[PDB]
Enzyme design. Structure first.
Site, PDB file in Angstrom:
ATOM      1  N   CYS A 168      36.306 -21.189 -52.202  1.00 26.52           N
ATOM      2  CA  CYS A 168      36.201 -20.986 -53.849  1.00 26.52           C
ATOM      3  C   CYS A 168      35.392 -22.057 -54.247  1.00 26.52           C
ATOM      4  O   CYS A 168      36.014 -23.394 -54.384  1.00 26.52           O
ATOM      5  CB  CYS A 168      37.453 -20.844 -54.143  1.00 26.52           C
ATOM      6  SG  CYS A 168      37.589 -20.950 -56.223  1.00 26.52           S
TER       7      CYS A 168
ATOM      8  N   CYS B 202      36.538 -23.580 -57.767  1.00 23.12           N
ATOM      9  CA  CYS B 202      37.756 -24.330 -57.628  1.00 23.12           C
ATOM     10  C   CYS B 202      37.722 -25.808 -57.421  1.00 23.12           C
ATOM     11  O   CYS B 202      38.583 -26.593 -57.892  1.00 23.12           O
ATOM     12  CB  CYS B 202      38.727 -23.727 -56.282  1.00 23.12           C
ATOM     13  SG  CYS B 202      39.107 -21.958 -56.546  1.00 23.12           S
TER      14      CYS B 202
END
Length: 108
Positions: free
Chosen positions: A32, A35
């Site tokens: 991700c 993230c």
């Protein structure tokens, strides 16, 4: 990253649902990209909100079990818990300013 509780599927009930007061939980994975944006943002929030808010992290790859129970369709999702109960959620990245807004909307 030291002030953040690192959650597992096994600890999650104790550190989150048994937790008194407010817990910010971050569901994330190594693939991700956004993230990585909010990770330093979350470190600063843990820094400044220390004592009236706990920040915690869950890697969904290492811990595949918890995110389906909250019907999490995408990461990063932030769940704010109060006394083991969901107070608010946020799906997607945000800025540091935005996260503070989010928290104020919930810290009555």
């Amino acid at each position: 990253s030291d002030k953040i509780i690192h959650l597992t599927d096994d600890s999650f009930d104790t550190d989150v649902l048994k937790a008194d007061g407010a817990i910010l939980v971050d569901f994330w994975a190594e693939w991700c990209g956004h993230c990585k944006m909010i990770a330093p943002i979350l470190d600063e929030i843990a820094d400044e909100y220390q004592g009236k808010l706990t920040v915690a992290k869950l890697n969904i790859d290492q811990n595949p079990g918890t995110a389906p129970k909250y019907g999490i369709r995408g990461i990063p999702t932030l769940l704010l818990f109060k006394n083991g109960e969901v107070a608010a959620t946020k799906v997607g990245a945000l800025s540091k300013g935005q996260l503070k807004e989010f928290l104020d909307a919930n810290l009555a």
